Amino acid sequence: TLKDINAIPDDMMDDIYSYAYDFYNKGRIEEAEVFFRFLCIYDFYNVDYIMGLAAIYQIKEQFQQAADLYAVAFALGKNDYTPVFHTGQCQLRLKAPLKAKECFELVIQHSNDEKLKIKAQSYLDAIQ
Amino acid sequence: GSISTAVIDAINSGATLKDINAIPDDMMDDIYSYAYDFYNKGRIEEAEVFFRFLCIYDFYNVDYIMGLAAIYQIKEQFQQAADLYAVAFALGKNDYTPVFHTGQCQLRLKAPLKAKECFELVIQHSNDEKLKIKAQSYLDAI
Ligand SMILES: [Cl-]
Ligand SMILES: [Cl-]
């Protein structure tokens, strides 16, 4: 891939990732999508690039598409449950509350991120 | 590999073969059977092709991912195996078997603290008592 051969310098890739988030934060979702797709073409194996594109799909209400990428991101990161938390959100929106409950429960049981667990527990408290 | 394909599919966000139900479940079941027929006879390279085929069609399938991850582990492609076992756990959050295998792979990748995390998770959360003994044997070695 382009990343394998260092086709673009590291600092310029950092810049592009930051610009992608600038677009996302100012609600320029179409431009952010182009940029996060560019990043994931450059390095499909970069968990934070994948999370950025998954965030785009989630904000576009493409919830299964986001959940799919969140599964890959979780797998590649191994011990970061943030993608599992966002998967739970996606499953709620897909009307799959038992799958969502499983996700938030997994965050509670495995995550060492205390702030993330507070958010997961709030979701669990509301699930019927 | 199988992960690259999944990510490329997600980027391009077009229609996939599965989107149009190009291969029915019954034929997928058959191809999976043939993959294990190859695997069990030692025809690992042909089994790998068949599991790669199943994972192109239906990547988000725990049984297909686990079959392919086992092949990479036996071939000592431990990073590819670890990544796929991690996908398998994501896809089946109540089976700690792929977490145990991820731990074995991490040990071979010289990542003992990652391995220890995996085996500790098995001990604390799995109800598979024999799997817990296996995980503990690795922890005792670390
Ligand atoms: Cl459900
Ligand atoms: Cl791959």
Ligand SMILES: [Mg+2]
């Ligand atoms: Mg799709």
Ligand SMILES: [Mg+2]
């Ligand atoms: Mg127990």
